């Protein structure tokens, strides 16, 4: 199906002494494959998926150089932004950046992204056309003008439409055994009585990949949202994901209720009932 490569960068200033804490992570779809942490002893980009360990020393040297350059850019920005917003030296502040590319089922370019935030709020982002900028406020407007004069969007468009997709396709091939494999959810239902008159049915989906999933309840064949609870999709810790959805029902009426599961790894949606 569709695939993506994304890089996420976070820098957090450290008032009082030294440089910011900087953490960078790379993902293909829902699989982390590289990391850099400024607090770690190696000071190298490090592998986080077995299929990236195929890359030679030139790759690791190059990624380390680039990621360190990224960290210095954020260091400078934190200083610049503190001044733009008239903030004191006493507080910790945060810059976050995300960029990457999406490809369709044919592995050709679909969409590119490059977004930046200061203290958890939008600052500047590349528009969908990869040609212009969305600036949230007047500080970001000054940045927009600087970046327009320096043709930053042109540089990013070249990476996002070219290099990003080329390397995504390489990773998809090299990690085919996992990255191109869908893991269908393993489903079951649990029952609990809260009192003599009320019961909870919980529909579970476990061990699935990718993370995208829909779990819904129906009653007598029609959608039920009232008296339901849906937890956020969560990582199992082994590369797969988990989710559940629950419904409160009158004791004795369990058979009216069906749970419906949709996932890429299922050719047709699944139905569960309390047996």
């Amino acid at each position: 199906g569709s695939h993506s490569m994304r890089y996420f960068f976070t820098s957090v200033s450290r008032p009082g002494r030294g440089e910011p804490r900087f953490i960078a992570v790379g993902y293909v779809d829902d699989t982390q494959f590289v990391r850099f942490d400024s607090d770690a002893a190696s000071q190298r980009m490090e592998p986080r998926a077995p299929w990236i360990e195929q890359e030679g020393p030139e790759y690791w040297d190059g990624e380390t150089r680039k990621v360190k350059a990224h960290s210095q850019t954020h260091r400078v920005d934190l200083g610049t932004l503190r001044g733009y917003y008239n903030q004191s030296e006493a507080g910790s502040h945060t810059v976050q950046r995300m960029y990457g590319c999406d490809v369709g089922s044919d592995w050709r370019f679909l969409r590119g992204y490059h977004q930046y935030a200061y203290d958890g709020k939008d600052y500047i982002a590349l528009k969908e056309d990869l040609r212009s900028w969305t600036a949230a406020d007047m500080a970001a407007q000054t940045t927009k003008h600087k970046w327009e004069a320096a043709h930053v969007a042109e540089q990013l468009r070249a990476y996002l439409e070219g290099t990003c997709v080329e390397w995504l396709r390489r990773y998809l091939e090299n990690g085919k055994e996992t990255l191109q494999r869908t893991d269908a959810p393993k489903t079951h239902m649990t029952h609990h009585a809260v009192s003599d008159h009320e019961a909870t049915l919980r529909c579970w989906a476990l061990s699935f990949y990718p993370a995208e999933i829909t779990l819904t309840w129906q009653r007598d064949g029609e959608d039920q949202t009232q008296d339901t609870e849906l937890v956020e999709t969560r990582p199992a810790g082994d590369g797969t994901f988990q989710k559940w959805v629950a419904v409160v029902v009158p004791s004795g009426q369990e058979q009216r209720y069906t749970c419906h599961v949709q996932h890429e790894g299922l050719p047709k949606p699944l139905t569960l009932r309390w047996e």
Binding site: G26, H70, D77, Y99, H114, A150, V152, L156
Partner: peptide, 10 residues
């Protein structure tokens, strides 16, 4: 692979 260019100060 990281972008080599386009990561410039704000």
């Amino acid at each position: 692979l990281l972008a080599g260019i386009g990561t410039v100060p704000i």
